[model samples]
Target chain A: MDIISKSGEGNKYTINSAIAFVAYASHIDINTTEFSKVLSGLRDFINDEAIRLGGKISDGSFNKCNGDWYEWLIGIRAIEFFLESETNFIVVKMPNATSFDVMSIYKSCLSEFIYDLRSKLSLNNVNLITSNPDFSIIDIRGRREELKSMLKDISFSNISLSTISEIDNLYKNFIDYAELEHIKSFLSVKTTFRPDRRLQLAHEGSLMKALYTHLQTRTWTINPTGIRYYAAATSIGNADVIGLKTVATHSITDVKSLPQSAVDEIFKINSVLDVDSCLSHIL
Target chain B: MDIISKSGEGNKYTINSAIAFVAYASHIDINTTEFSKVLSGLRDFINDEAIRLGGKISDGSFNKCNGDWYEWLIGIRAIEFFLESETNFIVVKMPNATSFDVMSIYKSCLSEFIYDLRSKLSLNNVNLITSNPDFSIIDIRGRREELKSMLKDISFSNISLSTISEIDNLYKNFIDYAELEHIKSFLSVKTTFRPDRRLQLAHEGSLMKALYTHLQTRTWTINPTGIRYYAAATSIGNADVIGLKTVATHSITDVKSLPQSAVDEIFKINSVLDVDSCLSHIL
Candidate 1:
């Protein structure tokens, strides 16, 4: 009998779900074999990129976001490759596993991204600022409410139940197929596309450049010890430049009392996109 | 059915050597359990002390040193208690477990110690400085000849092969007893007596004092970018004084530097024995 059960969708999603749920509840077994393969592939990709960049992976150089979008692209491409190839089998085999589960791979990928981002930015942490805090309390409150409304429209529940099962089966099948040489070869080819690297890097570079530019402007002053700055920096910026910049800039005085011209300058300086304009257009 | 073997000797020297080897191995296992208990106890102790002192456990009141004596007694006591107990156990159990395989337990304990130490120290993914850079390298060639002369004055031999099985059985019996009740008692006592709360407060207090004292004495120049303190603080007097002073006495150079001094003070201040002496002699 198969170690994992299959879902009604002719996939291993139901079985994968049962296994994961059991694993979560019992805390007994780990899906180490699958995790190991993913980990190994990730390490290999990082190693290869580190070598290509002529820097030790441990040292911080690989994270540099100099107008060169290639770095970000290569990093994202590595992640995409890992996802497309590493997660393909799970999607194809698992009956209950969904694209949502596969998307969870991004969480790990995002962690790596954040780590590399922190290293690149030379920041202890990242921060974000969504609205002008200098306005009257009512204005600031209104802006916060508006942003909240906007965020509510962003669809995180994009994966359907059927798709989840399909993805789950695919994931289990991938784990089962790990022992087969032909499957490995097929995944390597499918996941190793190099062209996508440039595009991914460009996208990352643009976002980072936008964030860095926004933070470097003197209009914002972040108070180091204040509770408001801490909360905003942690929550909004996802610990990126915006959050840090907000704290670094607006920390000295209430942003509301600052001259409207100075506030406008801060916004203007932050808006200057130096990394890759082309990538911004698509997004 | 015994797993280990050993030889018994009449003389103190042989017995000491046998005990040393066994303790080195068994101590590893015991140390982990002991340290965990100590840390937990320390936390509670600090919380109580903080309340009594009219400050929260997070406050920096109880961290200062007074005339070479630390403000707290928990850390030193924990270490002293651990060493003494382990030493006693060695004396009692070494003759029995001298031949039993204790390496597995030793390795496991060592791993646990490293893990616990890292967590306690708040070290994340960093290498520790392991050597004195200024120390001279040892020349083995001359030392080897000097050691040969010493070896000629000493007599050593392998234990008798006929008694190996008997020794092994004895060691197994010792391990069964040691691992069961004695070890369990030791761990339970340590857990019950752990002073983590006290240690944490003391850790914070000592650090603030160190920073305040360091700045007041002007012994070190702070690096704005990296928080590295240059060799302006030359003497232990300054270090000690800095570790005992209040945070308000010094100008804040960098908040990042705060955590480092706090860590340093925890280890350095705890190295003293005055508080215990005062309690035993004067009180």
Candidate 2:
């Protein structure tokens, strides 16, 4: 079934959709200064993808994301940016999020990278998700997916606004908004806020779909401050969001610098993806 | 010498002023959930000091910050923040910035942290400086100092146009704007798109000063969008700033949830001791 045209599964993947980008990625090497330059230039590299993804989610050019495509559209919103390369290489890959979280091993060797630069740009902090062999892909991806799944229920639709990818200062308070009713349906939890391993992993496939979608969405060009900002999906709960917290992502304002290769990469990514129901038997 | 009283030396410590913040230090045992709590409540924790610092730089109530006080005021702007311990104790210190890079030792063990989160709230990227234990304190601190001294020649006076510190998005084009000859005579360098190290370092101190200033300013309740934006000071050339990038630090239309202690932390942090001078005889 076409993802957006699904009968009852619309809402199923609603909260978690941006998880469908796939690529047969490769690698290239980059140093610190070059990395910084790349990151700063990322506003260009990330432009259309963010607008397209955000617009697709809202404007209807494309619809029904079952967390089934374009992992790069969202950098590290729901999770973390990993600099997984002591040696770097340019790689082309799919936007995949897995609970293996398979990441499906997409950009599998990538490590969660973050730049804590005290450089004067107010570029105080930066995060990156890059290929790294320093650690296991499964361990890195799975563990990351596990932590970010906290917001697995918030919906990737909720991750970005209708124009989610294009704006900034996008702060939301999801508290007291919805308790466990909708969450309980697929989640199988209690008033206590704990999701047992089984409960947590029951829909591991679907949840990771949503989690990965949300995780990468966090990396969109919302701010592009350190290179850019990452948009994220958080459970916002320790089961409790402390009432003072909020999430942020990258949002880009300029696009002249993006190379055509990057844009074409999106289409190539699109041609090979599947968007379908995340959880049916469990739900 | 009272900072403002000096006529020529004003611009000397401008760009690379982070050679200032000193710390008692960091490291901690924070679990994921608690980590989330600190982040969420951080806005509350960060609110006032951000504005106060911005305002102090602007309002003229305070003058001449040698990066000697208010460790908490600049938050990660001027230095790094360590959620180092659950067992908080008194190292009993002030907010100081130095080049060994005071930040060198701070996030020493800690990787630099920048959070790019995309929540429904458009809170984009967050920059974090956490605790690390990788280098010798003296070595890290000294190395940081060496790098930042580049900007120390720029002058702290160029920092705020009157209240550059207190200002928001405090933008300054150091490019062709000729305010001080030799940037008030504390520096010397070349005009090449280069990381010559020496030239880059010359203005780094002031640049970092502005960076930290603008960084903390971004936290001001001004937009809370985490996505709103950053304020920058461009070196302009070598001496040429291309355009405008603004800063907006505080905007607290709602403060009902903010804790009093959080606000008070500013005054508390400001009241401390000095670690060292960034460019004393070294210049």
> Judged by DockQ, which candidate is best?
2
Where does model 1 sit among the CAPRI classes?
incorrect
lDDT of 1 by residue, B85-123 (tens): 212221111121233332112224332433343354454
Give the chain B TM-score achieved by candidate 1: 0.17
lDDT to native, each model: 0.25, 0.22
- Across B142-218, the per-residue lDDT of candidate 2 in tens digits comes to 23443243223222213322222322111111212221111111111111123343233323423433323333332
Error of 2 at A73 (Å): 30
| TM-score, every prediction | 0.19, 0.20
Candidate 2 local Cα displacement, residue B160, angstroms: 34
Q: Write the per-residue lDDT of candidate 2 for residues A1-283, one digit (tens) a residue.
A: 1122222433221223322121111121221122223222332323344454442233232222212122323222211122222211111122222311222233311212111211222443543233211111112222334333432432222333332232111111211222111111111111122334222222232332233333333233332211111111211144322211221111122232331111000001111111111111111
DockQ of each: 0.01, 0.02
Runs in model 2 lying further than 4 Å from the true structure: A1-101, A107-209, A217-283, B1-105, B108-111, B115-262, B265-283
Give me the displacement of residue A117 in model 2, in angstroms.
Answer: 25
> Which ten residues in a row are the worst by lDDT in model 1 chain A?
A226-235
The Cα error of candidate 2 at residue A49, in Å, is 53
